[PDB]
């Protein structure tokens, strides 16, 4: 069973924790990777009901099981805050344009 289902992509809790640790470390260091400057500020335009506090940051979680290092991000993202608390696992898959839906 999947802990998070992002369209067709399957993630476990360990996949989420590994991607999140990698994202937070780059956030702490003031460093970014890729063309869309990951991790950046997630403004919550969709208005998701995240249990943890604002400011939020989006980072790519990959279907390959590899940590994001540049190039193509895919459609899947881990959302974390300033305290390294996970807000949610979101995806562009099944949402119009660059909008996001929550991973089930
Ligand atoms: N849909 C969405 N995009 C966001 C949000 N915060 C920042 N973005 C950025 O706003 C722009 C339009 O959606 C994109 O560059 C996108 O970055 P990403 O492509 O990296 O998600 C948000 O809360 N929702
Ligand atoms: Ca996995
Ligand atoms: Ca995008």
From Swiss-Prot:
Its gene is: rntA
Instruction: Tell me the keywords, alphabetical order.
Output: Disulfide bond, Endonuclease, Hydrolase, Lyase, Nuclease, Signal
Organism per entry = Aspergillus oryzae (strain ATCC 42149 / RIB 40)
The protein's annotated catalytic reaction(s) are: [RNA] containing guanosine + H2O = an [RNA fragment]-3'-guanosine-3'-phosphate + a 5'-hydroxy-ribonucleotide-3'-[RNA fragment]
Name this protein carries in UniProt: Guanyl-specific ribonuclease T1
Give the family per the record: Belongs to the ribonuclease N1/T1 family.
Q: What class of enzyme is it?
A: lyase
Q: Which GO terms describe its cellular component?
A: cell septum; hyphal tip
Q: Which GO terms describe its molecular function?
A: lyase activity; ribonuclease T1 activity; RNA binding; RNA endonuclease activity
Cite the EC number.
Answer: 4.6.1.24
Do the record's keywords include Disulfide bond? yes
Q: How does it assemble?
A: Monomer.
Active-site residue numbers: 40, 58 (proton acceptor), 92 (proton donor)
- Origin, by domain of life? Eukaryota
Q: Which cysteines are joined by disulfide bonds?
A: 2-10, 6-103
